[PDB]
């Protein structure tokens, strides 16, 4: 059929792609440079989609095919087509190459591909077993070049079990895997393992253990930008739930900055929602461009209403906002922070008063913030002066809030500190760029 | 030096953004005249940074040594 022949052609092109990736893996192991395995994994997400039964059937018929347990393991889980007319024997290894065992990296890549296909087919149980087998056989291996594919397979195994709605049978095993990766000095594998452990804790609400792990473990600096963004989001949630609001805001802004341009909509949605909540708690009204964006508009609409209520200062509006979308906030895992905002709303008003006025009288500030009595205003203002929200100094002798006089920052040292940080970053970037330089062997 | 480096950065912008691929290996050899790309480029960066670093270090050494 026309559709069938088109599918066969796409399968053949995918087979050519996998052959190219396996050749790259072999060249990487020969040259001991991750670059090639990194590119193979980079192409992996694209190949994850656009795969049917015959695709992987032909891949297993051509690759491997040594009568090994893999063929008797995945094939019983994946159907087999009839005698295809275009029986092109996809055999990159010919004669001696076929006899030689498949390279550990290449075999791991093929097992990862089959596991991804099982994921996309919702064969949760079969992917379970195939992932255990591949993980066990990769655990024995100790080649450095295998570590990146090991990290990818680790992440996909955690994902398969996450769809298994258990995500606890993995806790100890991923802890052990991450610890071994840390011992081995691996970077990508330990990065993915730490991110996945943090994700599991955040799912099951074990915040304290996650904070302990983040405090003790150290994330390698030379990690993937996407992995860094995921870790930043997880650490931002940990900090925000733990009352380190400023650090949470900074970390989540960094995570948003490091997001993959336009590749992951959902991660951006969640980061924006949590950042909006944290910023509202910290006393800053968030930017409207986020709410106006096309992809994030409908997702953040309840947060837009919440920000409206907070800025306007109408506690009743906040209550009706919670009534309509309270369950949505809960399902988003931000209900507790929203309640904290409900009881901290006065911080935004105090911050606005601090920005506007410089010597506001206590009675007038109490009137403006709809407080009942001036003494409550004094209490709230002092609490704000600690909370990093205001920089004033109450003069209780005459009861007026005297904001600190602004000073010429340039004549002070802060510009030197900012320039030092930026110059250090620039010099480090230059050193890193000239450091690799990928000079070929003559 | 900063103004002349701004002009030179304009020239470097023009040269790089062009990135003419009509045998780029030949392009880099048919425009070799000790010009914008790097010669009148980071040479000036080195001059500026050496002068500024030396001057600042001397100023701080004087602020410490002399009272």
């Amino acid at each position: 059929a026309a559709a069938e022949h088109s599918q066969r052609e796409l399968d053949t092109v995918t087979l050519e792609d996998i052959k190219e990736h396996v050749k790259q893996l072999e060249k990487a192991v020969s040259g001991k440079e991750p670059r090639f395995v990194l590119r193979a994994l980079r192409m992996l997400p694209s190949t994850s989609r656009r795969l049917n039964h015959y695709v992987l059937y032909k891949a297993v018929q051509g690759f491997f095919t040594s009568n090994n347990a893999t063929r008797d393991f995945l094939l019983p889980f994946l159907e087999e087509p009839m005698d295809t007319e275009a029986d092109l024997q996809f055999r990159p290894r010919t004669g001696k190459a076929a006899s030689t065992p498949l390279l550990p990296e290449v075999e791991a890549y093929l097992q990862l591909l089959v596991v991804i296909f099982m994921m996309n087919s919702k064969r949760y149980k079969e992917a379970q077993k195939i992932s255990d087998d591949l993980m066990q056989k990769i655990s024995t291996q100790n080649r450095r070049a295998l570590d990146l594919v090991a990290a990818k397979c680790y992440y996909y195994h955690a994902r398969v079990y996450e769809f298994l709605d258990k995500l606890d049978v993995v806790r100890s095993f991923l802890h052990a895997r991450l610890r071994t990766a840390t011992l081995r000095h691996d970077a990508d594998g330990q990065a993915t393992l730490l991110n996945l452990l943090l994700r599991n804790y955040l799912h099951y609400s074990l915040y304290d253990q996650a904070e302990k792990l983040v405090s003790k473990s150290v994330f390698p600096e030379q990690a993937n930008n996407n992995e860094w963004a995921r870790y930043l989001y997880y650490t931002g949630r940990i900090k925000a739930i733990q009352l380190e609001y400023s650090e949470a805001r900074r970390t989540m802004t960094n995570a948003l900055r490091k997001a993959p341009q336009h590749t992951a909509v959902g991660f951006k949605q969640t980061v924006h929602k949590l950042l909006i909540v944290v910023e509202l708690l910290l006393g800053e009204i968030p930017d409207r461009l986020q709410f106006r964006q096309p992809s994030l508009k409908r997702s953040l609409m309840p947060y837009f209403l919440l920000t409206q209520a907070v800025r306007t200062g109408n506690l009743a509006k906040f209550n009706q906002v919670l009534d309509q979308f309270g369950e949505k906030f809960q399902a988003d895992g931000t209900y507790t922070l929203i309640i904290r905002l409900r009881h901290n709303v006065i911080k935004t008003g105090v911050r606005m008063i601090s920005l506007s006025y410089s010597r506001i009288s206590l009675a007038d500030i109490a009137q403006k913030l709809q407080l009942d009595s001036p003494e409550d205003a004094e209490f709230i203002v002092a609490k704000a002066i600690r909370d990093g929200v205001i920089e004033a100094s109450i003069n209780h002798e005459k009861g007026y809030v005297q904001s600190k006089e602004m000073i010429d920052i340039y004549s002070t040292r802060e510009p030197q500190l900012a320039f030092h940080q930026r110059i250090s970053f620039c010099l480090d970037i230059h050193n890193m760029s000239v450091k690799a330089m990928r000079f070929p062997p003559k | 030096v900063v103004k002349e480096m701004l002009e030179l950065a304009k020239n470097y912008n023009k040269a790089v953004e062009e990135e003419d691929k009509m045998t780029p290996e030949q392009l880099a050899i048919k425009n070799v005249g000790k010009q914008d790309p790097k010669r009148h480029l980071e040479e000036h960066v080195d001059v500026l940074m050496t002068s500024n670093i030396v001057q600042c270090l001397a100023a701080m050494l004087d602020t410490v040594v002399f009272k």
Partner: peptide, 30 residues
């Protein structure tokens, strides 16, 4: 700081050029 930014940009451009040259040589190898 401006000099450091210029140096970093030049180094990054040189790294990009060298990487593309290496990739082109490898591709033309086979």
């Amino acid at each position: 700081y401006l000099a450091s930014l210029i140096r970093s940009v030049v180094a990054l451009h040189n790294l990009i050029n060298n990487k593309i040259a290496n990739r082109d040589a490898e591709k033309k190898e086979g």
